[PDB]
Amino acid sequence: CAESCVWIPCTVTALLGCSCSNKVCYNGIP
């Protein structure tokens, strides 16, 4: 997922099924 929650949490890919694994959204897909 093209979303890194370094400061701000995922909002775009959040509804796509991506969770913050480690300051970046990575759930199956990048």
UniProtKB/Swiss-Prot annotation:
Quote the InterPro entries the UniProt record gives: Cyclotide, Cyclotide_bracelet_CS, Cyclotide_sf
Question: Which pairs of Cys residues are joined through disulfide bonds in the record?
Answer: 1-18, 5-20, 10-25
What is the tissue specificity? Expressed in roots.
Q: How is it modified after translation?
A: This is a cyclic peptide.
> Keyword set for this entry?
Disulfide bond, Knottin, Plant defense
Q: Which Pfam family is one of this chain's hits?
A: Cyclotide
Q: Which domain of life is it from?
A: Eukaryota
Residues forming coiled coils: none
The family assignment reads:
Belongs to the cyclotide family. Bracelet subfamily.
Report the function annotation for this chain. Answer: Probably participates in a plant defense mechanism.
The name under which this protein is listed is Root cyclotide 1
What organism is this sequence from?
Viola hederacea
